[PDB]
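Hey forum,

I'm writing up a methods section and want to include a predicted complex as supplementary material. The small molecule is myristic acid. I've pasted the protein sequence and the SMILES. Can someone with a working setup run it? I'll credit the forum in the acknowledgements.
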Amino acid sequence: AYFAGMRPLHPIDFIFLSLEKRQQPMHVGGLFLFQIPDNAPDTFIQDLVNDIRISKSIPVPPFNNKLNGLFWDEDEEFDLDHHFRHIALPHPGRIRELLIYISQEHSTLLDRAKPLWTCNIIEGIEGNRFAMYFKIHHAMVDGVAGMRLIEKSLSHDVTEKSIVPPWCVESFQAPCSILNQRVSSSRRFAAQSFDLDRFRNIAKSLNVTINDVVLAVCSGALRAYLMSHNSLPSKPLIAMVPASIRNVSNRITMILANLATHKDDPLQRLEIIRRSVQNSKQRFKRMTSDQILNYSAVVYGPAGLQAFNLVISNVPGPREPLYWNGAKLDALYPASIVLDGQALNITMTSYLDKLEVGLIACRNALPRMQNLLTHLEEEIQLFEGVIAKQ
Amino acid sequence: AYFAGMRPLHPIDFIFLSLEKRQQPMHVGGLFLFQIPDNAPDTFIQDLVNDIRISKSIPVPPFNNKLNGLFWDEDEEFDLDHHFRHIALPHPGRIRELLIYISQEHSTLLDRAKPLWTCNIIEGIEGNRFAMYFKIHHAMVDGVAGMRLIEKSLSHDVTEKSIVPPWCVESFQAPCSILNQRVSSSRRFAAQSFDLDRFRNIAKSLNVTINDVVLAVCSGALRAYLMSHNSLPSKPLIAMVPASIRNVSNRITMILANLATHKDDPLQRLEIIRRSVQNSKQRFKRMTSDQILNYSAVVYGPAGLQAFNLVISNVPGPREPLYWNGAKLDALYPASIVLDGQALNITMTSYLDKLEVGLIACRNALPRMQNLLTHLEEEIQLFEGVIAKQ
Ligand SMILES: CCCCCCCCCCCCCC(=O)O
Ligand SMILES: CCCCCCCCCCCCCC(=O)O
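Reply by user p_vandermeer:
Happy to help. Structure tokens for the complex are below, copy them as they are.
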């Protein structure tokens, strides 16, 4: 064995630790929005956190794993107050201020002396909700593995009562642009839910896929945002994009595609994007460790002359609702990684027939990045408008 | 493909690049001693180097490979005077001063902007010899892969004349000790050839393996050296050692073993070592990439509470002589890697029924480390003495 019980790091794990620097933390995160149960006492949160604070249960893997050289070792002294925070948003708890708080928290490095995760419970969200923000290093999980952890730790049964804390359960065509700039550590997170049936209706009317429509909505929104800052490149943006929107224990194949942001017509943009996705020869399967390794090298350590301007990621979420001690998971937003030369990341999760959009950027490279949420909505409306006339 | 022709780094490659720091370069080296041909003109070296300087031939892989992000790319502009040096040792060219020169050269980092190798030709060595010192990053080759490059680039035929430069051809039981100390970048290299038949005769007389005898010779020598500096630990040194001395395209399995340096009798030391090598349960095969990966993690990124005090490596060399433009390869010495917590490395190569010993150390952790060559000889003589009486 290896030091009696330890496990060597996987090469994938080691990539994300070696590439982490002050200016580019290599953790991912999930913003969970929970609806307080209809029949819950006013002390529902206080009691849930109190059960956590007094619990004698020990974290189960991977939450009890910590680094020891090039090996995963077991944490023998769980330090709750290192990993856990319970705070409240001041009245009236608007989503604006929640996202400010998450932007700040997503900026800070994880301490490598302890298991590489933290958990925030934020009470007082408008609309009778509370939030959990779970930060976890990419050396431990990517989005798909994170989703499996979510499904193991939460319940599909609204009646089941939680008895332990969640962590104890069971070739270079891309132009220069302001997106491609050295980054700071300070982040801006902008998140919003969209009804997936709007994209489904557009796809059916124009005889394309939902993935085609989503990518065209992103393209038009990026074109509008860049134009508003007089920063639209002459050549179109190139992006690493999914081949599909949902694809069986599977990570979706990723494709190098032309986003056609230099065209001024939405149908023209959609047409170029659809063809590019269909016909691109730079296709990166993510079914085997080696395939995932090679994809990770392309994306996080690309060779240079750049190859692409941004990554648009898709992390499938569950189709059936989840619950925490009876509280319904109302929304789930992904927060991914920015790094030098990639100051904007777009990641999306499908959950309950919603498209959960998580935008993460370097605060100083992309000012007012949150405007992209408005540009996205306006682009959906544009496609809906042209179909309404047709 | 990956950027049209490039190749992703192997995880093994990436370990040796990521762990390199100022104080611990991660290159290996070979010191080649050549005998000038009996019928050679006095301008043999001048002409060989001149043929190199004027050659229009291009390096072949791996010598034309260079880093580009997390990928191997092709070097499109070979810069001879970056990679190549021709110097002379001042008269009378003793081996003492050759090893001083190699100690200094083995201390310096390789520039990552170019292919990760350099070649030194040193003329004027005593005894009608010249030396080649070839430095190459472990991200490109380990010892066994290096030996295969040597056999491809040199000739087995004394009559064959070279027409191109060589690069164009075709659980924690180990005590604290001064060996286990943070290191500087400055190196001391101490190299010497021993007749392998002396170890063979000892092995036959005492009914043990040659590997058993070599390890016992190392143990007694290390005990004497440490005692001479009042630095012999009370507990025995633990070492990562080979299971055999020659083992088919194979890397020898490595074993965690008790060197028994706390015993004062050579036969006692030999007995403990032989049993430990036979019975140790920490055995690390190196037949597959995964196995080599895991071995590399143990050795170069060990977990801590250390596990071992040093590594004694064996790199098999050819059994038949090699030649360069008629000049016989008379001797071949390996120079390996020291790092934080491992200030001494012992590596050995079998060539022409000789045991070629290459000792490499942090200059400042182990003063007068070259005395170990004397202690090694004295230990062989000790075993020969006890057999002569028996
Ligand atoms: C119960 C603990 C679950 C932890 C889930 C953390 C969030 C999942 C990652 C979302 C972003 C992934 C980005 C990506 O890999 O493309
Ligand atoms: C023709 C170029 C050949 C380059 C050979 C360089 C020397 C081989 C490495 C010797 C030390 C190896 C240490 C080890 O891996 O255990």
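Some notes you might quote in the supplement: The interface with chain B takes residues 2-4, 6, 8-9, 11, 14-15, 18, 68-71, 73, 171-172, 293-294, 297-298, 300-304, 307 of chain A (CB under 8 Å). Chain A is about 30% helix and 25% strand.
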